[PDB]
């Protein structure tokens, strides 16, 4: 590896120097949106759900296409009309400080608890399983990396840098463990043999009677709990959806989204498939003795890290740079946002009304450091969790539904008032662990779907008996001229709908259909990227 750290170094140094060294149409915007998905994390804990379920897993992101159009038509008209920029923003027009407060003190618990504690773990399995440095280690360097963005740190070409490697990077190992599998056969016969391997894997709506039903409840990935997950994801804490979009026109903007929704589609064929191919490799005895830190039921995530080992010499330490340098950008993102929640909703807002800016930031800077400490403390825990992206999905689940039910009324009934949905949110946390924590043997979608309905019949209730008035003084009234959308974007969405019913079917209805399937969508996201970034360049 005389090569890949010189390569590695090269990578990170360009990263480091061109940061140093520093109107939308519907295209971007749409790139820009799904990007997101496409980072270090989701590589490592897609896979790791690729590993131990499979593509049922590609739900949440396939999903999010269908949550997108309807974000799109009806959900950012509303905060276009009624001049909103932030969800904070958003929470204070439509009800008050003090349940901005308590939504602030619910996000700085995720931040920490949830996100940064599993990026650092994910990250920090990556570095174990390629380097060999144990993950007490591997996470405490990642941690020590970031507190030098967070203090000293202080944007967009390394981003589509980042992407780029990180597209290429999950092809390339894709490639290279597909091919492994097809032997002298090639590529075509891996794809069509890990298939035949592991038909399970490919199966997207789950039994009962599957292991892995408690994470993925079979039916409730189209009627259930994942509408929870995916409106919290788009409908409301996605600032970038208001953001990229007061960046052009609505119509052109709308277009964006759904294109994004489109790009939804192709993502999982990069990130969840390595950890398919991960599997049926791991699982065959013959190809184990061929090759002569592996992926477990406990360590899944250890698929994708564990797959770009095998990598060849030049293309090792790119693939590697460029994980390590996302892990990184994507901890000192989530420590800046959560920094800015604790100076300027807690903060500024309790502790010194009047610090200005200057104070503000190495108030947020001191903020950041406690925030990664205390992450740092906890994500050597995660350990042996098993798939990450479950801890992530569980937990954010334990707030997800109802923030989501305040949100959601907040928009559409005139009646809700804050009285109501400060009594329903805090409600909603006793209820959620009531269902966790009792022996019911209930998977958590189904409890985050039971947690969101608790809390709309709380707020609802308490706010019909609460308010004098018929509709709160602050209830958004603007309807029907404000859903409107162009016929490109209607017949966009007619196509995505009548795509996800293909794609949910396709396995049932024709098996050998399939391969063409897993090709044509790995494709279509290899050449979907280089062409985006091309254009990106003009």
């Known amino acids: ?167 290429l990077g999950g092809f390339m190992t894709t490639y290279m463990a597909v091919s492994f599998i097809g032997g002298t056969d090639g590529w075509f016969a891996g794809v069509s043999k890990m298939v035949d391997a592991a038909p399970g894997h490919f199966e997207m709506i789950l039994d009962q009677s599957n292991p892995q039903y408690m994470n993925l409840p079979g039916i409730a990935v189209l009627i259930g709990g994942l509408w929870v997950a995916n409106l919290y994801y788009w409908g409301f804490n996605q600032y970038i959806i208001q953001r990229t979009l007061a960046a052009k026109s609505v119509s052109e903007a709308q277009k964006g989204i759904v294109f994004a929704a489109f790009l939804a589609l192709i993502v999982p064929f990069l990130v969840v498939l390595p950890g398919i ?47 390590a340098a996302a892990i990184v950008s994507s ?10 929640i604790f100076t300027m909703d ?6 010194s009304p009047d610090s200005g800016d200057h104070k503000l930031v190495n108030v947020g800077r001191t903020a950041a450091v406690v925030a990664l400490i205390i992450a740092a403390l906890i994500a050597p825990m995660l350990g042996g969790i098993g798939q990450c992206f479950q801890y992530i999905q569980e937990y954010t689940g334990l707030v997800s539904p109802g923030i989501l039910a305040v949100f959601l009324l907040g928009l559409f009934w005139k009646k809700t008032t804050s009285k109501g949905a400060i009594i329903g949110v805090v409600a909603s946390i006793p209820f959620a662990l009531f269902l966790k924590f009792m022996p019911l043997s209930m ?60 794609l949910y079917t396709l396995f049932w209805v024709n098996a050998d259909a399939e391969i063409t399937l897993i090709i044509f969508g790995v494709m279509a996201g290899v050449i979907g990227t280089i062409l985006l970034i091309s254009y990106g360049i003009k």
């Not at 009624?82 to 349940?99: A, D």
């Not at 807690?346 to 502790?351: A, G, L």
């Open 331 to 340: 901890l000192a993102s989530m420590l800046n946002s959560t920094a800015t």
């Open 443 to 502: 998977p958590f979608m189904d409890q985050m779907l039971y947690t969101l309905l608790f809390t709309m019949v709380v707020i609802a209730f308490t706010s019909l008996s609460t308010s004098i008035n018929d509709d709160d003084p602050k209830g958004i009234s603007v309807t029907s001229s404000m859903f409107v959308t162009d016929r490109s974007f209607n017949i966009a969405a007619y196509g995505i709908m009548i795509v996800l019913a293909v």
């Open 277 to 323: 191919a991960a599997y049926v490799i791991t699982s065959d005895p013959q190809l184990m003795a061929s090759l002569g830190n592996l992926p477990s039921a406990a360590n899944a995530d250890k698929a994708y890290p564990w797959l770009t080992q095998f990598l060849p010499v030049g293309v090792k330490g790119v693939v590697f740079a460029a994980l």
């Open 346 to 351: 807690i903060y500024k807002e309790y502790i």
């Open 1 to 167: 590896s005389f090569i890949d750290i010189m390569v590695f170094a090269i990578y990170v140094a360009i990263i480091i120097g061109v940061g140093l060294w520093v109107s939308l149409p519907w295209w971007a915007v749409g790139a820009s949106l799904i990007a997101a998905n496409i980072s270090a994390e989701q590589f490592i804990g897609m896979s790791g759900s690729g590993y131990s379920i499979g593509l049922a897993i590609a739900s949440y992101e396939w999903m999010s296409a269908i949550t997108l159009i309807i974000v799109g038509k009806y959900f950012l008209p509303i905060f276009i009309e009624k001049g909103i920029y932030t969800i904070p923003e958003f929470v204070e027009k439509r009800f008050n400080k003090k349940l901005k407060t308590i939504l602030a003190v619910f996000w700085i618990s995720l931040y920490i608890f949830v996100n940064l504690t599993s990026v650092l773990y994910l990250g920090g399995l990556a570095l174990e399983t390629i380097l060999g440095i144990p993950l007490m280690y591997s996470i405490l360097g990642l941690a020590l990396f970031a507190l030098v963005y967070s203090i000293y740190g202080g944007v967009v070409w390394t981003d589509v840098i980042q992407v780029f490697f990180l597209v």
